[PDB]
Symmetry: C2
Subunit: 195 residues, 2 copies
């Protein structure tokens, strides 16, 4: 019965968003995609021109029963997220209500830091944006999970598998993470959750 | 400069398709997505439910100036490709005219082998479908490039980066492939075009 809300804005990074969605569905997690900062328009043009159709406007789904809210990166998508009062409030509400916030690539530095959503609490993001993340919070790691604040972060398009697998591990369990990983033909240095 | 025709069908594997498109654009390759939906529909529902929009129906663009035709996997999307006379015709024409055919995951075994498009040449594909590739052609490599017949194949969602980078190497060159790789935060077991 686990579910995820995956946010999409103009300029979101399509590999990050789609890889994550696909893995979550492979993990048996129900995914809803939400259009952010488009006044309800479901057509989203991503950072390298891939066009997606979101399921619903964020304002219609923000109050639902999801276990995780996912913020893909892509600098311009992340800026839309940052500048959306609804997005920011929804992320805060997910946190305060004991749910997971998952953010990749530009999203940590661009969305979470300026709004002080997670002012203590370990976090990563795209490495060339390292300086935008407070020194004491930064870790240069493919995926960072801070259970104290239920914050999952990750670094880039190439870490989207690692990111999605950790969401599965947290929501469904290790066995299912391995089941999913085992069918992807993953590169050798990525953790596969085996026994 | 270089261009790529990326085919899409109902049931295409969205991580494979989108990762490839993203990397090709990062490589400076002009990408056109073509719907192989039998009715010409462009709003494609992929294998895990992601809704992608194709630029054009295949009939309108099959005759274009492209250096490579790319066949994503996904079982039902590859079946659509196999069962499309225009798709098969187009792949044969790319091959006979000295251009590249690139196929990942289910596409080699489902599209290429039944139509005997490559009676000679090394190929890979999704490992659980290995028995569907003639033993004399099968290799268990993340990416297989057979220059003799200009056939590029790859194995799964987790090899989509490897696949896309090799397309860049072939269409643009090693420098650009390395440039793109270096932006991704990719895992250590993916060749990064250094040396």
């Amino acid at each position: 019965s686990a579910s995820a809300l995956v946010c999409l804005a103009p300029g979101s990074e399509e590999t990050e968003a789609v890889t994550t969605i696909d893995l979550l569905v492979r993990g048996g997690i129900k995914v809803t995609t939400a259009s952010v900062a488009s006044d309800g328009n479901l057509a989203i043009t991503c950072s390298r021109g891939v066009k997606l159709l979101a399921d619903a406007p964020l304002v219609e789904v923000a109050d639902g029963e999801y276990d995780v809210i996912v913020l893909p990166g892509g600098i311009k998508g992340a800026e839309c997220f940052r500048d959306s009062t609804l997005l920011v409030e929804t992320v805060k509400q997910f946190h305060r209500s004991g749910r997971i916030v998952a953010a990749i690539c530009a999203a940590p530095a661009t969305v979470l830091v300026p709004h002080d959503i997670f002012p203590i609490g370990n976090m990563t993001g795209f490495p060339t944006l390292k300086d935008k993340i407070p020194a004491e919070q930064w870790l240069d790691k493919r995926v960072v999970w801070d259970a104290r604040v239920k914050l999952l972060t990750s670094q880039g398009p190439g870490t989207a598998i690692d990111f999605g697998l950790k969401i599965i591990d947290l929501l469904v369990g290790r066995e299912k993470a391995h089941e999913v990983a085992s069918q992807l033909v993953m590169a050798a240095g990525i953790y596969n959750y085996y026994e």
